[PDB]
Amino acid sequence: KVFGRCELAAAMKRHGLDNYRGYSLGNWVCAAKFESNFNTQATNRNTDGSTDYGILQINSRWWCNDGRTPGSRNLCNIPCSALLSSDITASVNCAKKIVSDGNGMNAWVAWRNRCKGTDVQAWIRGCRL
Ligand SMILES: [Cl-]
Ligand code: NA
C-alpha cells in the first residue's frame, strides 16, 4: 500500500507513535517519506546480505526474521514479511523497539541525514489529526 502523507500521519498517531520517545509525528512521517516513499511494500538489499522492509525500512540483521540473514536476530519477533502489510501495526510496534535501543531515531540513517534538525512539522501541516 502506498499511503498518502496525512493518511500515514493519522495511522501513525492511531498506533501511538506521536511523541513516542519524544519524537513528534512529523519526524516519523519524514523518516517514512525518505525510507520508503510511504510504500509498505518497499524492500532494499544491503551489501552485507541483510534486507530492509516496509514503510520504515526495518532491517533483518537485528529486528525481523527473513531466513536469509546469517547470524542475525529477530528482536521484534516477526517475519520480515509482516513489515510489508497494508496494516502498519507490525512496523509501528517494531519501530517503537528500535527507537528505544539507545540512539533514538539516528537508527534510521536517512532520518539523521534528511529529517533531523529540519522543520519536520511541515510533514503533518494541514492534516486533520
Ligand atoms: Cl515537529
Ligand atoms: Na533476522
Side-chain angles (χ1 to χ4, degrees), residues 59-67 69 72-74 80:
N59 184 264
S60 62
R61 195 287 178 224
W62 284 107
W63 305 108
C64 63
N65 177 56
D66 65 11
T69 311
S72 71
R73 301 290 285 278
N74 178 10
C80 297

Side-chain angles (χ1 to χ4, degrees), residues 30-101:
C30 185
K33 171 68 178 183
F34 296 122
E35 292 293 354
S36 68
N37 205 17
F38 304 148
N39 188 348
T40 71
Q41 297 194 82
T43 60
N44 174 77
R45 171 65 39 77
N46 295 302
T47 312
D48 71 357
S50 69
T51 303
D52 306 319
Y53 297 86
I55 58 159
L56 287 166
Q57 289 291 277
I58 290 173
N59 184 264
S60 62
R61 195 287 178 224
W62 284 107
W63 305 108
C64 63
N65 177 56
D66 65 11
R68 54 150 285 128
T69 311
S72 71
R73 301 290 285 278
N74 178 10
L75 296 174
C76 295
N77 303 296
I78 50 167
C80 297
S81 64
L83 303 166
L84 307 184
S85 174
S86 57
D87 181 333
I88 70 169
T89 298
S91 279
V92 167
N93 289 347
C94 190
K96 288 176 179 179
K97 302 165 142 294
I98 296 167
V99 76
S100 304
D101 198 50

